[PDB]
Amino acid sequence: MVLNSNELEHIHSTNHSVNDISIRWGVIGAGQKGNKEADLFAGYKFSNGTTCYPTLAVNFAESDMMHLQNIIKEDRIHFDRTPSVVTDLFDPETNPNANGYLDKLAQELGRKFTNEEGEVIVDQFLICLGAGGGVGTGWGSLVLQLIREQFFPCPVSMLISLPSGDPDEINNALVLLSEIDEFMREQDRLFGNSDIKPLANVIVNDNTQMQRIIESQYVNWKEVANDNVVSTLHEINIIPENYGSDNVTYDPSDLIKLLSIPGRFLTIGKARIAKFDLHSLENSIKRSLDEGFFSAEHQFETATMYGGFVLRPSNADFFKDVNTENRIRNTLGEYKRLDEIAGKFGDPIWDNEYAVCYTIFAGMTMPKRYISLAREGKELAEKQEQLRAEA
Numbered sequence: 286m287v288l289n290s291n292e293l294e295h296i297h298s299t300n301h302s303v304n305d306i307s308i309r310w311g312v313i314g315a316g317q318k319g320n321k322e323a324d325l326f327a328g329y330k331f332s333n334g335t336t337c338y339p340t341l342a343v344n345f346a347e348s349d350m351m352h353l354q355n356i357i358k359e360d361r362i363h364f365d366r367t368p369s370v371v372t373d374l375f376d377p378e379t380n381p382n383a384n385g386y387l388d389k390l391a392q393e394l395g396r397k398f399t400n401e402e403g404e405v406i407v408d409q410f411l412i413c414l415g416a417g418g419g420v421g422t423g424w425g426s427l428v429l430q431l432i433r434e435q436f437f438p439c440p441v442s443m444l445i446s447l448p449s450g451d452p453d454e455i456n457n458a459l460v461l462l463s464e465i466d467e468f469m470r471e472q473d474r475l476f477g478n479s480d481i482k483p484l485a486n487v488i489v490n491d492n493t494q495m496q497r498i499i500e501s502q503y504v505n506w507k508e509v510a511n512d513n514v515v516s517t518l519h520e521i522n523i524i525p526e527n528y529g530s531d532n533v534t535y536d537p538s539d540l541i542k543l544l545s546i547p548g549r550f551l552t553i554g555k556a557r558i559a560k561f562d563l564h565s566l567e568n569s570i571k572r573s574l575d576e577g578f579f580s581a582e583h584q585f586e587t588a589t590m591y592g593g594f595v596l597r598p599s600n601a602d603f604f605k606d607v608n609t610e611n612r613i614r615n616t617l618g619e620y621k622r623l624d625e626i627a628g629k630f631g632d633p634i635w636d637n638e639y640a641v642c643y644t645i646f647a648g649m650t651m652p653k654r655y656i657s658l659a660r661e662g663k664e665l666a667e668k669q670e671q672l673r674a675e676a
């Protein structure tokens with residue numbers, strides 16, 4: 286059983302009835318980053334020892350998989366550094382024999398995500414990519430195509446990492462984010478507000494932002510980032526199914542709507558609160574949204590939907606108070622006025638000593654990290670253009 290956060294450790298040592306999640310993810314991880322994250326999801330188990338997430342890892346290099354932990358070799362899909370090469374190999378025209386590549390994929394997909402009775406055991410797909418790579422980013426474009434060709438039995442969610450500072454990795458990331466933004470706009474004019482979107486959301490993480498948080502607190506920066514990112518997603522999946530409130534309960538259906546309907550960019554703040562004061566509460570909430578693992582200068586006022594919950598002790602006098610539920614409403618209100626959009630904010634109960642406040646904004650436009658990333662990007666391909674002058 287994989288337990289890669291204090292929150293998950295507590296939960297499983299206290300609750301022995303963790304037998305269900307809010308939304309049944311099917312995790313596909315592509316490229317080394319993607320595989321490594323998928324590998325973690327694969328490790329999660331219910332209280333009764335069953336796997337939580339059916340998980341495939343996909344790659345072109347078999348060296349980016351031979352050292353995985355929780356993914357059976359059978360579930361390591363292999364095909365015998367430019368995003369084009371991935372897409373190209375899966376085109377009826379561009380590659381001659383791309384017929385026996387689509388097929389392998391579609392087969393293994395049915396193998397891992399369908400019943401015997403040809404049903405589907407998953408609610409949405411969670412695809413993991415370190416945008417910037419060749420295998421990874423390439424798979425980003427590939428997925429967007431497959432979604433048009435209605436290849437997937439249900440909606441797709443993308444978990445995407447943004448590169449630190451390699452000018453090539455930056456290019457790939459930008460063309461992908463660009464291609465994503467362009468899918469999202471098309472999706473917006475093809476489907477209504479109420480409608481279930483084929484691309485449910487995209488969750489981004491900034492490597493620069495993440496490395497920074499990590500050095501603040503031997504230790505591997507990506508191993509730590511991965512644990513935080515993945516555990517958070519798992520936690521927000523676990524909690525609404527396994528923890529209720531006497532006041533306001535964020536239940537699974539609420540989360541499902543939030544992850545399924547907005548159809549654009551999504552972000553999460555996880556804030557630990559032990560300091561039970563209105564001030565330091567406000568502060569760690571703000572910290573988690575602006576300088577947390579999921580932050581990338583998001584455009585908060587473009588959010589069409591919100592959600593989240595503060596997980597608190599059984600006698601948390603504080604999280605009962607009007608001003609508490611008022612200060613929270615106001616702190617969040619600074620990012621997006623809450624009376625404007627759909628959502629719900631819970632306050633579930635748990636056996637713990639501290640609390641944790643989870644915050645989610647969905648349906649946002651392109652994060653501004655795109656801009657500050659590009660600025661970097663252009664100002665580099667010029668520097669090459671010049672150094673290309675010399676000789």
Ligand SMILES: Nc1nc2c(ncn2[C@@H]2O[C@H](COP(=O)(O)OP(=O)(O)O)[C@@H](O)[C@H]2O)c(=O)[nH]1
Binds near residue numbers: 318319414415
């Ligand atoms: N957040 C995060 N980023 C990673 C991790 N591993 C690699 N990356 C970065 O994500 C990008 C993805 O490329 P990588 O997966 O290493 O190779 P490729 O996808 O097979 O081409 C690179 O820019 C890596 O620096 C990880 O575990 N976590």
Ligand SMILES: [Mg+2]
Binds near residue numbers: 316349418420
């Ligand atoms: Mg690789």
